[PDB]
Design a protein around this ligand. Structure first.
Ligand SMILES: Cc1ccc2oc(C#Cc3cccc(C(=O)NCCN4CCN(C(=O)c5cccc(C#Cc6oc7ccc(C)cc7c6CC(=O)O)c5)CC4)c3)c(CC(=O)O)c2c1
Lengths: 136, 137
């Protein structure tokens, strides 16, 4: 388990690259449409917001990025080794913005607020706060 | 000045804007470097995706002259109230302390937000205040 474990990825749409982070214990995500310095910033933003102790990615691309290695060193983040749902909502909302950016962040909003349990139970937004909260 | 109640307002350095959302109860803050209500409407919708944002307070009229902002607030259920019931100072201080450690301004900004939100012997952090507030409720 843990409060500050996260997973990292890139997904793609419109020829644009959607940087996406998940909280693994909650499923809470934060995305951006964005290279190596955007992601550092991303990570830096994330890290001042949540406890971020460890970030897993699937490829080797991040182990090789100067700005990211320095972001993680400043913020105290270990990098370690080891979407299709998001894209559905962007669909339902894509016409509702001229910008793919705006569409990525409505679906984040929907993903995070809707009920995990579908009807009862918490949403991902509530959980990452509960988990964390439970911790202290 | 309590539940999902944030203050929003601007500050400037090195010829730029920094939007600054302040969660009134915790002292928690987010920030973004921006070209001045298109870009302002992206920061509220992400926020509202991170947290519970019901009322946004501004102490000027700019926010209301922007349909993109107004569009974002209606989508999210954010109440745009007028009237904000010196953080920028503190933060600009910290930015002040750290600017040389990164290249673009937006990095040191995010570094300043990090320090403001995680640093309290003291007792609790702005970042810990907001998580608890939101838990209880
Ligand atoms: C209903 C409704 C509601 C809301 C709506 O909103 C819109 C819209 C729009 C719009 C359009 C254009 C632009 C924008 C806008 O606001 N852009 C700015 C935001 N930006 C975020 C994303 N970022 C970036 O990653 C970025 C860029 C440059 C550099 C970096 C970095 C870094 C960095 O980190 C570090 C951390 C640690 C260490 C040790 C070093 C480093 C370094 C290295 C360094 O030292 O350098 C990051 C830069 C800043 C918004 C619509 C319209 C529509 O679609 O219908 C709409 C409709």
């Amino acid at each position: 388990s843990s409060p500050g474990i996260w997973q990292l990825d890139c997904t793609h749409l419109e020829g644009k690259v959607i940087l996406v982070a998940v909280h693994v214990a909650s499923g809470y995500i934060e995305a951006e449409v964005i290279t190596g310095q955007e992601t550092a910033y991303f990570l830096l933003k994330l890290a001042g917001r949540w406890p971020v102790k460890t970030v897993h990615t699937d490829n080797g691309s991040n182990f090789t990025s100067t700005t990211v290695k320095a972001a993680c060193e400043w913020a105290g983040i270990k990098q370690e080794f080891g979407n299709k749902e998001l894209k559905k909502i962007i669909g339902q909302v894509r016409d509702q913005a001229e910008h793919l950016k705006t569409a990525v962040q409505m679906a984040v909003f929907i993903h995070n607020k809707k009920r995990k349990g579908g009807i009862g139970g918490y949403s991902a937004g509530e959980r990452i706060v509960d988990i964390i909260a439970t911790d202290i």
